[PDB]
Design a protein around this ligand. Structure first.
Ligand code: HEM
Length: 465
C-alpha cells in the first residue's frame, strides 16, 4: 500500500499532544494501539514517530530489518548536552567509528573476562562491608547500591574506583538519579515534545541541564588531568586509550576522534553503566521483600551451590537456574527503559506493507515486549516461573529484551549481567531482607514511567544470615 502507518490526526505543532498523557506515555501509546494496531504513527509535538508494540513487531524491525532500523533517534533532554556527539546519540560514520572503538576498549580493560570479574567481586566485597556497616538499621539503599555499581564502570574509564565517602562522588550520583527521574516525570516527557521552546524557559528542565552540565564539567576535568599525565604506550583507562587514538588521528581532518566525542562518550558510559544497573538492583530488592517465598528459594540455591564462605563467581550461574530466572524476572518486571532509546530509519523502508521514509523516528516499546501476553502467562505479576520450565530449569524467552535487540543494541549488556548476578547473589548470600512494612502492603508499582521506570522510595534493613 506504500504508505506511512495510521494514527490519531495531529494538529499543527502540538501534534497528538491532546490524545496523550505526559505522566503516562506508555499507557497512552498502548491505548492508541488498541485502536490502530501494534504499529502506528504518533506525533510528539513536531516529532513524527512510528511506534512498535509487542514482540513480533519489534523483532521484525530491529532484527529482521536491522540495518534499516539501525539509525539512532533522539531523546531531547540528553541531546541538550550531547548534541549528537558521543557513541550513544551519534549516527552514521561517527557512530560506526565510536561504537567499534568502545567495545574493543572495553574488552581490553577486562569486560567479559577475569579482570572485570575480579573487579566486580572486589566491589561486591565493599558493598557487603558497607551493608554490615549499617548494623541492621533500616536505611535507604539507593546510594549504597549506585556507589557500588558506579565504581565498576568508573574503574574502566577513570582508571580507579571512588571512595564511598567521597562527597563529590555522592554529588555525581545525585545528578544521575535526578536526571533519570526527571526524564520519567510528565514534564520530562512534555519536554520530549516541546524542547524547541521549553529549553529556553524556566522550570524543572533547567535543573536537569544543570545536572548534565555538572557531569560534563566533571568529565572535562578528568580528561584534562589524564591529558597531562599521559603515557602514550601505557594507557591507564578508557580515556587514555581514546587520547592515544586522538594523537594518532591528528593529521586526519575527517577523524571522529576528537575531544568532544571523548568527553561525551565517557559521560555516556558513566551515566549508562550506572543508573540503569542501580535502578534494576533497587527494584529487585523491593520485589524480593514483597515475595518472601522467592527470597527463600534463592537462599536454598545459594547455600547449596556456593555455601557461606567463598565469594560467588560468575560461572556459578550455570548451576543456579532459579537465581537466573529471578534476575530475568526482575529485569522483565522492572522494565527499566520502557521505550528503549529511539531508533530512526537509515533509509526509505517498506515494513509490513507500510512506508517509512528516511529519517523517521522509531519507538521500540520494549515494555510491550517484556509483557507480551503471548510469551508470558501472567505478565502483570512478579513470577520467576516465567523463566523456568516444569523441572525448574532455566527457560529463555524471545520476548526478553531489556537490553533491546538489533544493530544499536546495548553493548554494555555483558558487564550489566555479570554485575547483576554478582551483586544480587553476593548480597543474598550474606543477608536476608527485612522490609519496613508487611509484604502484602508493599507497593511494587512504579513512581514514574517515562524514559525510565522508577520504583517507589523505600527503606529496608539487611540482617546478617
Ligand atoms: C541492567 C542495565 C542496562 C539496561 C536495561 C540497558 C539498556 C539499554 C537500552 C534499552 C539501550 C538501547 C538499545 C537500542 O538502541 O536498541 C541501551 C544502550 C546502550 N547501553 Fe545499556 N543498559 C544497561 C546497562 C549498560 C551498561 C552497564 C553500559 C555500559 C558499559 C551500557 C551501555 C550502553 C550504551 C553505550 C548504549 C548505546 C549503544 C549504541 O548506540 O550503539 N548499558 N542500553
Amino acid at each position: 500500500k506504500g504508505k506511512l502507518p495510521p494514527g490519531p490526526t495531529p494538529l499543527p505543532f502540538i501534534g497528538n499532544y491532546l490524545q496523550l498523557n505526559t505522566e503516562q506515555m506508555y499507557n497512552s501509546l498502548m491505548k492508541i494501539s488498541e485502536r490502530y494496531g501494534p504499529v502506528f504513527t504518533i506525533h510528539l509535538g513536531p516529532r513524527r514517530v512510528v511506534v512498535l508494540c509487542g514482540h513480533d513487531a519489534v523483532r521484525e524491525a530491529l532484527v529482521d530489518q536491522a540495518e534499516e532500523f539501525s539509525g539512532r533517534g533522539e531523546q531531547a533532554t540528553f541531546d541538550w548536552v550531547f548534541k549528537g556527539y558521543g557513541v550513544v546519540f551519534s549516527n552514521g560514520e561517527r557512530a560506526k567509528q565510536l561504537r567499534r572503538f568502545s567495545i574493543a576498549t572495553l574488552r581490553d580493560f577486562g569486560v567479559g573476562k577475569r579482570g572485570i570479574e575480579e573487579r566486580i567481586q572486589e566491589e561486591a566485597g565493599f558493598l557487603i562491608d558497607a551493608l554490615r556497616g549499617t548494623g541492621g538499621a533500616n536505611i535507604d539503599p539507593t546510594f549504597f547500591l549506585s556507589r557500588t555499581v558506579s565504581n565498576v564502570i568508573s574503574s574502566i574509564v577513570f582508571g580507579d574506583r571512588f571512595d564511598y565517602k567521597d562527597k563529590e562522588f555522592l554529588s555525581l550520583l545525585r545528578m544521575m538519579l535526578g536526571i533519570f527521574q526527571f526524564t520519567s516525570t510528565s514534564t520530562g516527557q512534555l519536554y520530549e515534545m516541546f524542547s524547541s521552546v521549553m529549553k529556553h524557559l524556566p522550570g524543572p528542565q533547567q535543573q536537569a541541564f544543570q545536572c548534565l552540565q555538572g557531569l560534563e564539567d566533571f568529565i572535562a576535568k578528568k580528561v584534562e588531568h589524564n591529558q597531562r599525565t599521559l603515557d602514550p604506550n601505557s594507557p591507564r583507562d578508557f580515556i587514555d586509550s581514546f587520547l592515544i587514538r586522538m594523537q594518532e588521528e591528528e593529521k586526519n581532518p575527517n577523524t571522529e576522534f576528537y575531544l568532544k566525542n571523548l568527553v561525551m562518550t565517557t559521560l555516556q558510559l558513566f551515566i549508562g553503566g550506572t543508573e540503569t544497573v542501580s535502578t534494576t538492583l533497587r527494584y529487585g530488592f523491593l520485589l524480593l521483600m514483597k515475595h518472601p517465598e522467592v527470597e527463600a528459594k534463592v537462599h536454598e540455591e545459594i547455600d547449596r551451590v556456593i555455601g557461606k564462605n567463598r565469594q560467588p563467581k560468575f560461572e556459578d550461574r550455570a548451576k543456579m537456574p532459579y537465581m537466573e530466572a529471578v534476575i530475568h524476572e526482575i529485569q522483565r518486571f522492572g522494565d527499566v527503559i520502557p521505550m528503549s532509546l529511539a531508533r530512526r530509519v537509515k533509509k526509505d523502508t517498506k515494513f509490513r506493507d507500510f512506508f517509512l521514509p528516511k529519517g523517521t523516528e522509531v519507538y521500540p516499546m520494549l515494555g510491550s515486549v517484556l509483557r507480551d501476553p503471548s510469551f508470558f502467562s501472567n505478565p502483570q505479576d512478579f513470577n520467576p516461573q516465567h523463566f523456568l520450565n516444569e523441572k525448574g530449569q532455566f527457560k529463555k524467552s524471545d520476548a526478553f529484551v531489556p537490553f533491546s535487540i538489533g544493530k544499536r543494541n546495548c553493548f554494555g549488556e555483558g558487564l550489566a549481567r555479570m554485575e547483576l548476578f554478582l551483586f544480587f547473589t553476593t548480597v543474598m548470600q550474606n543477608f536476608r531482607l527485612k522490609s519496613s512494612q508487611s509484604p502484602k502492603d508493599i507497593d511494587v508499582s512504579p513512581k514514574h514511567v517515562g524514559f525510565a521506570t522508577i520504583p517507589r522510595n523505600y527503606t529496608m534493613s539487611f540482617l546478617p544470615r
